Swiss-Prot record:
Gene: LGALS3
Domain Galectin: 5-135
GO BP terms in the entry: eosinophil chemotaxis; epithelial cell differentiation; innate immune response; macrophage chemotaxis; monocyte chemotaxis; mononuclear cell migration; mRNA processing; negative regulation of endocytosis
Binding, a beta-D-galactoside: W68, G69, R70, E71, E72, R73, Q74
Assembly and interaction partners: Probably forms homo- or heterodimers. Interacts with DMBT1. Interacts with CD6 and ALCAM. Forms a complex with the ITGA3, ITGB1 and CSPG4. Interacts with LGALS3BP, LYPD3, ZFTRAF1 and UACA. Interacts with TRIM16; this interaction mediates autophagy of damage endomembranes. Interacts with cargo receptor TMED10; the interaction mediates the translocation from the cytoplasm into the ERGIC (endoplasmic reticulum-Golgi intermediate compartment) and thereby secretion.
Summary of the function given for this chain in its UniProt record: Galactose-specific lectin which binds IgE. May mediate with the alpha-3, beta-1 integrin the stimulation by CSPG4 of endothelial cells migration. Together with DMBT1, required for terminal differentiation of columnar epithelial cells during early embryogenesis. In the nucleus: acts as a pre-mRNA splicing factor. Involved in acute inflammatory responses including neutrophil activation and adhesion, chemoattraction of monocytes macrophages, opsonization of apoptotic neutrophils, and activation of mast cells.
Keyword field: Acetylation, Cytoplasm, Differentiation, Disulfide bond, IgE-binding protein, Immunity, Innate immunity, Lectin, mRNA processing, mRNA splicing, Nucleus, Phosphoprotein, Repeat, Secreted, Spliceosome
Protein name from the UniProt record: Galectin-3
UniProt note on tissues of expression: A major expression is found in the colonic epithelium. It is also abundant in the activated macrophages. Expressed in fetal membranes.
Chief location category: cytoplasm
Species of provenance: Homo sapiens
Motif Nuclear export signal boundaries: 113-128
Any one Gene Ontology molecular-function term assigned to this protein's record: laminin binding
Full protein segment contained here: 114 to 250 of 250
KW Secreted (keyword) present: yes
Length: 137
């Protein structure tokens, strides 16, 4: 698939919706981003950073009216440059639940409350993208 990639989420997200992204991190990657969007707002920005002051960190945030909110940071970093990955995002009633390569990574409490209006997923950054899909579990 071409990156950046836009995956429509028809009628928004709902609990029990599982989104699966398969790809490979490019060699010498710098960043990856998944952006769950409600129009121009970003309900959930998931942003692995491969070199922030020589550390690897995952940053999560929400953008409302073009302004970023309080960052939530995770030091557990399951991505490796050059290697294939699977990201699964499970929508639960109170949070997005993220697993990478079948291991739980983090939860992100819903800041944007109108789940039915979060109708696009943007995928960008330093990856080769193989597949992006969703199903109900
Ligand atoms: O909050 C998320 C946003 O962060 C900003 S960078 C942000 O800048 C601030 C000053 O304006 C602070 O410096 C902030 N900070 C917070 C901390 C901190 C927090 C706790 S200890 C240290 N140390 N830096 C730092 O993260 C990125 O630019 C945004 N971004 C990424 C992308 C993208 C596109 C394609 S792939 C990625 N498109 N927009 C997005 O990730
Ligand atoms: Cl809302």
């Amino acid at each position: 698939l071409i990156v950046p990639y836009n995956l429509p989420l028809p009628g928004g997200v709902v609990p029990r919706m599982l989104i699966t992204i398969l790809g490979t991190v490019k060699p010498n990657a710098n960043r990856i981003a998944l952006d769950f969007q409600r129009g121009n707002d970003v309900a959930f920005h998931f942003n692995p950073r491969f070199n922030e002051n020589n550390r690897r960190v995952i940053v999560c945030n929400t953008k409302l009216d073009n302004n970023w909110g309080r960052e939530e940071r995770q030091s557990v970093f399951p991505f490796e440059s050059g290697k294939p990955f699977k990201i699964q995002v499970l929508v639960e009633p109170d949070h997005f639940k993220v697993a990478v390569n079948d291991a739980h990574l983090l939860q992100y409490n819903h800041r944007v409350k109108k789940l039915n209006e979060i109708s696009k997923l943007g995928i960008s950054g330093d990856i080769d993208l193989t597949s992006a899909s969703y199903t109900m579990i």
